[PDB]
Subunit: 253 residues, 6 copies
Amino acid sequence: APRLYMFQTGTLKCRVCNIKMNAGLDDYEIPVPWYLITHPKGNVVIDGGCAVECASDPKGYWGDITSVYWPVMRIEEGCVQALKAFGIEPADVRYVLHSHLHLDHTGATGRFPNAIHIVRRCEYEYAMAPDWFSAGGYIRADFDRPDVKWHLLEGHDDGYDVFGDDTIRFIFTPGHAPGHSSFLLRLPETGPVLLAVDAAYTTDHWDEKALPGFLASTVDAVRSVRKLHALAEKTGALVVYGHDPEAWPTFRL
Amino acid sequence: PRLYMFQTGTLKCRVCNIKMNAGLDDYEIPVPWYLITHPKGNVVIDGGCAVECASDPKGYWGDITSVYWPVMRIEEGCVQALKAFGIEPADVRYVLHSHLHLDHTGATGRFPNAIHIVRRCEYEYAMAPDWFSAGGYIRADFDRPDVKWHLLEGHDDGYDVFGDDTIRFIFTPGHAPGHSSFLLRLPETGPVLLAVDAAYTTDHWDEKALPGFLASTVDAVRSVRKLHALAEKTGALVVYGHDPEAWPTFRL
Amino acid sequence: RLYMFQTGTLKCRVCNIKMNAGLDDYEIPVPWYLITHPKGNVVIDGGCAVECASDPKGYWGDITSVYWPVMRIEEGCVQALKAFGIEPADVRYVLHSHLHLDHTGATGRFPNAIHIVRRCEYEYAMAPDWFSAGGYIRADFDRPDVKWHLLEGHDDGYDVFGDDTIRFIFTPGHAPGHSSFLLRLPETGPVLLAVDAAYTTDHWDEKALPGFLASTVDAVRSVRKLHALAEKTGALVVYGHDPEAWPTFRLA
Amino acid sequence: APRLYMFQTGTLKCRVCNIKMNAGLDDYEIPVPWYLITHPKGNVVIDGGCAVECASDPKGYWGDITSVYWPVMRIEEGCVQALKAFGIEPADVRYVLHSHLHLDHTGATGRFPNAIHIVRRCEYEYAMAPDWFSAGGYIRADFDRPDVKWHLLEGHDDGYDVFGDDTIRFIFTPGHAPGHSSFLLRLPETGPVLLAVDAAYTTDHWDEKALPGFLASTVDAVRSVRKLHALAEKTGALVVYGHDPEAWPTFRL
Amino acid sequence: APRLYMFQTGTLKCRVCNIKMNAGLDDYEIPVPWYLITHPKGNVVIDGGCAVECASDPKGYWGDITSVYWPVMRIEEGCVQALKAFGIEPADVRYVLHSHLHLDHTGATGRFPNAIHIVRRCEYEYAMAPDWFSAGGYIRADFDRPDVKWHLLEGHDDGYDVFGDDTIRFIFTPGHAPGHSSFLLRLPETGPVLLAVDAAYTTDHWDEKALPGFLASTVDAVRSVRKLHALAEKTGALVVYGHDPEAWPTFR
Amino acid sequence: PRLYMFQTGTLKCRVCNIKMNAGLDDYEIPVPWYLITHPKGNVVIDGGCAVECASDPKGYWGDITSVYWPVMRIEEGCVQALKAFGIEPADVRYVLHSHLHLDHTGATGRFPNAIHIVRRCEYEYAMAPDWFSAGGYIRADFDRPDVKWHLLEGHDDGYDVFGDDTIRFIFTPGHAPGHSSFLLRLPETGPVLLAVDAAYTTDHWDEKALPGFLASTVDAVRSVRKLHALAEKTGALVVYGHDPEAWPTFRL
Ligand code: NI
Ligand code: NI
Ligand code: NI
Ligand code: NI
Ligand code: NI
Ligand code: NI
Ligand code: NI
Ligand code: NI
Ligand code: NI
Ligand code: NI
Ligand code: NI
Ligand code: NI
């Protein structure tokens, strides 16, 4: 029966303003979550965190963006590595799901050779052709790989049900990135779990006391938060914020 | 035709408000507005902050004054300064709006014969804003039943007010959903590119800053590059929106 | 359970309901709906505002020359629910077909209720055109303490509880964000609340066009969309303003 | 030097409500204008009025719709016949412009053997596949002819300049019909002339005291009227309404 | 309990290039599939192959297009006749579904007097007003009949469930034609069956070794195939290609 | 201003790659590119195949060479031919791109001061192509971080490079998503319509052929009829994109 495991590729060191827009220039540190869903029909990885290469050579693999987001992580936190130790070989992953293609969410891409990769077309298309302000958050060595099998979702695909049994559904949440998606999970014992990912970094974002410090569209981002508000109230879901260093320890990790 | 660059005083805020994530230090900006006198009629662009802000900013603007504190004198109100200049309110043919933010709707409905020209989507957004931008829209300024509006559509980019290339709307979405800059052509100066809030300062123009308040980052930076191409094509003189350093260097 | 209420009637002419059909006086019921659900009570629209029972001219304004509301104070949706056994705090959702004046009596009268309507109806209600502005009562729907869920273009079929009990069925045309509702109840089975997508059997049978509408193309295609839905589901079809059909239904 | 000639193919007999929505069932008669532009680069016909077949067999050529719109016209009023009488043979018309493809505006279609027919793509497409409420207003025998050379304009073609010299321009005015276009004309002596056609049936529609009694979108219709308000104010144009039995005799015919 | 019957209206003789783009002028022959679903709630015909008139007088009914696609079929293969030999009379068909409105998929249109015809709106509208390169492929004698009851699906209707029980669902696959739809079926014993129709002529098309030889959009056609890949991989569906002379005998 | 029509040798391919489904015969086409010398600065359009193809085709283009074999000398490289003509690489103000296919990106980035103008949707498609078109996009040409781009938007049709009617973008989608033709106005010659790949040959122009490589057939044929109307209106001299019979009849 299906289960949800919450992992973390270490942390990112940045400023408060990168998380909470115009909030200040103090140092600040955030977890990098990623998720595994074990399912009778196959295992699912969501995003995979920062690329394992960041544990050894961040400046070489990410480049100048490291002056903004410094990744603090060990080699064994790499998604492939963490999974091997957990007992799942890279070949035993049926799906990689992507909320979006930012640099702390593409560690899984191409690392699971049998996995279909599911993401919004417009995220893939923006990733390949970013604007200058966001070009550094997209690592082509992660997501630009000819060997990858992609399922690129269209605008009408909101709610896409990965297995067709309501276990995992994409919940489109544009704004933080053009093709950003959250996920609604339904587990037999826990019930519904809402993975906001970067549609709501922190409880302050969810409560409309902060704007994301990086974003493609503020108009979409705040409407997407309210869309999640309605979804959380309808389902009673447990809400998991994308990058909340105060709430992250309170969940099952 | 002539272009007069007035200013409705200044705004006191933080640096982050103008340059996103750039710090919390105190910062002050001019609030431009513009007069074009034309043989076919006078044109006011935006008109600055409402004159009521000179007396009672908290009463007229409300909570938003905790972010943007307006410093102006009554003399600076756009009706008053134009009255003291020889221009009677009835003697204004057009009011043009870059957008309907609070420091750009001082002229709205104060000129009783003016057709008010703005993008439809700015007008619609102004009437139904999201929570993060609602404070910056003052309904007392733009929500007046008596106003004659021409609401531009998406195909209207480049709209030529007189049909003679003196004043054209240059759509620059991003800072607000219906934000527009303006390209002026004057007999002697030639082309003047009024960036307004598409490019607050030279740092934004040089892609060293993002706006601290914005509807869409994607649109805003693409709109700046649109202006780059227009400036390079025309040789226009580029007037930034709220630049304390560059503003004194213009004929004011 | 579904309970079908009404807030009195409206007095108009036949042509306001069946376009171009005559100036004879005409009277129509104003339905509104209550769904009792184990997970929470649902109010659809709520009829004309209760303020209309006392001071119609004062509350609705000039539009009373077109639509005169005739209702008692006890027909107000709060009052009628209290009489029924349901206090205003015991209402989890208010659903809006659209935001015309005879459909916003419930807005903001239920302090814990999430209000669900198409975003494009909310936005049009805030910035309407001159022909429809009188049909949108800002005193009803423009309350800043109201909690909205504004549905997007892809949310057609939105399932309020997640259990096929109540679904939005987008039916643009009569208003830009008009929605009908498809209900499924255990004993009755499917019930299709057309609301203003089809005022009467004449509209449903394509012998009439609505006497007020934003788009005729959308309005007729929305009726045919309902035709297919009725035919697929076998639903009981409830017309929105039909004086002959309305007494034949079960009323609270 | 270019000139504008305002013709008419008789009248239509209907009810007041067909012209001014919901304004009563009284009997009502309207002129059916069409226009000829003389130009050094060629002759231009706008719409051409009702098909000359309506002067003889209205019920046979139009059908059931004659119970709503009864055409009163003589045979010599057909656009081919009146142009011959005037001095122009059918082969000497270079452009047929269509405001829209309603039955009283397709008398010219395919009657001019060398003319390019210019109309909005979306008007042409809707005319081929209308809805039930408007199917009777589109006469397939007029506009569905395989010999006709069409230039179908797209949405970005607003302002289209037929000759390239500001003499005749399409002014898109959706609402009455999906692809309805008005025309802005500039003549050497008269200056600007605004042909509203069916964007503004009468002065009453222009002053926003009436709505069209037949229309595809009220929202587009009133916004298109206000678009024409702005154009008339900007240019000083003489405004010619499309079916105004009180204002029509006040123009040069 | 529902069943899928796979029929055929003879073949089409054409060139290979008509089926696999730029693959050669060699002669080629392809089956013309069509489908019947028997369902407790009614019988459903999908497309219905070529018109029966093609068995008698091809040139007279199709016109010049018979120079590209020659139909070889017998009058008993006409969809009304082959159903009359199976167990069902024309009046006992509740729904006619259309993948698109090309000549080899409009044999059923208007032949079943009570059948609601379900197709994408944009297919119906394109068929009424096609471009020159494709007009010959649309036979107005088949689909332009005023007696036909149409349900015209909109863009948001992807997934449309005919009966509301997952037996037959429209799977939008634009590209071969603007309004082209494939079908996902679920049968009690067989499980999921994916009718690709003309979104994937052959297994070369499925395997991205061939583009369609006739198409409206190549971009949409290839993205539609990849969308079917994802559907096939998720459901384990049996994939039925639309015009494959080799694989077609492997089916029942 | 003057127009000079150059060519980077030829392409060897099949007939069908040019005229769809028209056969597997050997075929050769010229590869035009254009220079406009203008008082306000020189303009290169496209620039032909990259000069690297004259030395190492298989190395620079890869597998696509099995479809399009390029036959050119180093001297034909756009930078080389311009030097020999008297124009150094620095003396090019603008590089215009019809589209970003391999035979039209020879100039990209070879002129260090040149603003590069192309449709946004072409630049975006080139960066993320589908499998059938990925071969035709050469990253080594257009994916250069140093290049200064002006990316035209959907409303920019008719874009006027110098603002004096000499060179205008004429959007012609279909052969590629963001393909554009160009209408030139020269003082002595009058109008010149560079169709580029919107009309390979006179047979495409005359609607006796479809292009052998295609993003959208619907757009491509409508773009050809758009060019028809433009040529009829202006009397333009019509230059086809890859026509081996017509190309010698023009001034080279
Ligand atoms: Ni992110
Ligand atoms: Ni992140
Ligand atoms: Ni602003
Ligand atoms: Ni400002
Ligand atoms: Ni209503
Ligand atoms: Ni109502
Ligand atoms: Ni009309
Ligand atoms: Ni008319
Ligand atoms: Ni087909
Ligand atoms: Ni077929
Ligand atoms: Ni090409
Ligand atoms: Ni080429």
